[PDB]
């Protein structure tokens, strides 16, 4: 094959955005829709192609899921969201039944690239297209912690004056609540964070604030203008990039486990190495007290919450 | 001052993808939102801010009509859409009442960087917006048939199998329905379209539908999925890279008239030199016998509008 | 491959260096190995040019030998010695010929099945030759012919119209060299007719007959100030590279291979044409009003002798 | 100024043209200046260079004299002549100062009031020199110190680790030469101790130390293979002023004005610091273990005597 094939599956406000973000970055000249209301896809197509006469070349149509069969990557932003009365259960329960449905379909087509998974909830749900697909587990990308990160930067930013990517700051953990900011393991040009933090007047107490704001802005902004996209879109974009361009980048993802952290058969949010192979490396960052804690607690739940729901799904 | 400051007017689907496209393409280091709604403009900066981690940095903020004292550059996509049982000449008196309410304020801020005007219809308010401010003419860019130009080229792209950034290829007029295709202007690698057609096949009958599908193109997309913004997001985003890096980069545009196609004192699509000064040059297209008339026919009718508009507005 | 892309380069003199380190900037392909005779320089360079990549895209750059092609999916060959003062153009024609014979078997034997872009001076005739002796097919052997004195005469009319080079659409096109043309008649900035913008500017007949052979000397004027020219094609290379490695189908000035297209066949020739993955998708053959009509047949019929005879020869 | 952004280079060597070419790729700044002693190479260089903006973003390439800085964003200087065999380091400071002299009184006669990046070896004396001259704030002449070497540090640590060099943040700090030294107990990959790093990856000690040396030594193995290096600088060169122009406020290791930081004030020396529209932003004074601290002094206490001798006996 001559040219790179993204199929996006699931077109909401988070997939549409990443398709935008593609189109606008000249990445994957072959970019495959696929979702239940073909009427959608199609009219999401339609305006996607528009861009292209002003950024690179791009094939943009709607698809089935046999569109997988010469795909390089997959991108899984298909869940619904959490409807008012349903627990955090429900959503899992009603998200892995989605996930089964999108998996099976792309594997009977014979796809054999990289999947990247991005529909909440992340952690639990890289562990079930891990789990349903059969594919090696380096080739499951998980989006996890990618966009908390980011948002724990812009914060560091605007509070040091510092370009956002020049702070090495990263949210791990379990995606959600029980997340942390490891700030002992943060720096910025080599210098701790911790250090620019006491030189800077900041305490331990604004940094806690930090960390809450950080697992708070979905809320926020879902509050004022009813959902959150951009953020995730280009975390989405930019891990696309890492695969597609072979980087070997640093980036906080949802990894797999194989010893790091005393953690095993477990996706979680981890600095790793992201290449064509999909996750080439975790990279396993020191924890102080607070951190280690953190990720022990946000560990041991998802672990049981993930295999009581592929239990449940079967 | 030290970086470049862009205002977007109007935090809709088109307003909020035009952020986001600017974000990806790391165009302005400052980038003010100013709309009604103080709780959704806000929401959408704190959302395009989480980009910032992987683009180029940007300070993006909800802001008031003040903050163009020390702007570059005044994106206007603000006005209401057609409602059913409302008449064009409604829509047309409804979006001037909206368009005197934004350009007052920010000429009160004394604002004297350049405007591009992109509420619907656009070279009506174009027009308006030069009246209202006083500007001089080549300081207010209306962006016109940028889009619809955009969708020809993206059309005679995949029918040609060329990148559509090659197909040299302008819808011109009024954007809307009395826009017409200069298909004998038009070239693909110096050789007239009108020579490709005949040699690939393509009847004057095709070409004429291949325009039809041009001006119904927005019909359809919002049809499927409710809205169209990514064309335009991104047509605004170009032409807001030719101002910003002072280009002097040919686009179709509305352009303010003075003696070319035999129209003055009017706004309207043609190829036109883009530069840090706004428009620096018309370029005057060979029209044949069609194009010509449909030329006239639709600067003639959008004249009479455009005055009737700013006479009732006052 | 497609996935982690790898471009070769043979011929690491000051056009080639200028390519890689083009092909730095711009992050294209992630692997790109430097073949030349000289391996001390070949290598000196591949650790110049990696110091870059701490500030661009990640890139694999070394100095290998001609196996290394086997996996690749293009070869860039800039080889071939320039003209010394009493060479005549037969004997750089005839020494670069035995030259370019000596890159492309070993090219060839590595198993190589990517894309050529051929950038030797003459650059037509080596064009014609590579693909002679390769055995490869037409499509997949792309020559830079006449994209950097396009770019020349693009970047001259638009200092004249304060217009972004980039919009000028103007071909220079025939055999890169003394006996090429400015295809004015079919150029244009955004659809108007060049010859009509150069009434309206004052700009006459005259006028446009020395750009066009300013175009055709710029090359001599840059050598007598500072020695050699490489900048415009090392941008020109990069250019037609990412059309081939992105797969753009993106219309380029290049040497062309030819099939009817202005009364010619089994030639490479300048002219405007469609890129892609599979080197030349597709020939645009431009109306020539009645002056360069004459220049592309004269410019063609003393290329095509010069070729076959050359061929001849090295054969 | 701001709107249309005007960068001067001064010196049109391997250098600066790399630089110029760099920035040409790149599409940053607009105009862009060259200014050299022989105008028939800085002409002929702006001849080539401009043939590339037919792919590249516009920009208005020229060579000009020293009044161009008026109205200029930001001056670039390379302008130096290199290490002659029978010269001492001594008799290359004192010849580089009278250079710099030369050009720092004209860019300053003729208004210019932007900011200054110096590259010119020694880059750290030659900084100094630049500040003192001009009478500028210390935050407006940027030096390009340790950028370069830190890019070699970033791309060595790279290859042994299969990491993307971008994101190795390690820093080589100090006095641009021999005296320099990594930064590795203040290293890290995603936030991952590099010490660490080496210990899990079999990467001892006296490896680390001879990577260490393998940078200092990198210029001579490339000037011995290929008779100069440039595109590692160019490349620094061109990330520096990106920096400058985009106000990025980035984290960069350049030679930065010292007021504290390390126990050192009144010298330009290699540290990571943040970079804006204004120049020297904010130093990173970053932790240093024993052996690091004590070759920040030593680097530092040397680079301070020669630069107050030098400008003692160029005033």
Do not use: W
Request: hydrophobic fraction near 40%.
């Amino acid at each position: 094959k001559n040219h790179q094939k993204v199929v996006l599956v699931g077109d909401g406000a988070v997939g549409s955005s990443y398709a935008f973000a593609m189109a606008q970055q000249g990445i994957a000249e072959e970019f495959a829709i696929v979702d239940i209301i073909k009427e959608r896809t199609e009219g999401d197509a339609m305006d996607l192609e528009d861009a292209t006469a002003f950024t690179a070349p791009k094939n943009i149509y709607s698809a089935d899921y046999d569109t997988c069969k010469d795909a390089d990557l997959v991108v899984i932003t298909a869940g619904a969201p959490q409807k008012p009365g349903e627990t955090r259960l429900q959503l899992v329960d009603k998200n892995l039944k989605i996930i089964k449905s999108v998996v099976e379909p792309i594997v009977k087509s014979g796809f054999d690239g990289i999947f990247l998974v991005a529909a909440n909830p992340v952690d639990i749900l890289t562990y079930a297209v891990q789990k349903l697909s059969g594919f090696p587990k380096n080739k499951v990308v998980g989006s996890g912690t990618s966009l908390d990160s980011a948002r724990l930067r812009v914060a560091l930013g605007k509070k040091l004056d510092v370009d956002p990517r020049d702070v090495i700051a990263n949210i791990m953990g379990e995606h959600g609540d029980s997340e942390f900011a490891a700030y002992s393991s943060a720096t910025v040009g080599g210098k701790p964070l911790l250090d620019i933090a006491k030189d800077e007047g900041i305490s331990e107490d604004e940094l806690l604030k930090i960390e809450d704001d950080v697992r708070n802005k979905a809320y926020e902004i879902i509050n004022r203008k009813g959902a959150t996209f951009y953020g995730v879109a280009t975390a989405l974009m930019r891990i696309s990039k890492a695969i597609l361009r072979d980087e070997n980048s640093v980036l906080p993802i949802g990894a797999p486990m194989n010893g790091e952290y005393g953690l095993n058969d477990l996706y979680i949010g981890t600095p790793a190495v992201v290449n064509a192979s999909g996750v080439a490396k975790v990279i396993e960052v020191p924890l102080n007290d607070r951190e280690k804690k953190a990720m022990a607690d946000s560990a041991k739940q998802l672990e049981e919450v993930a295999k009581n729901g592929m239990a449940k799904l079967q």
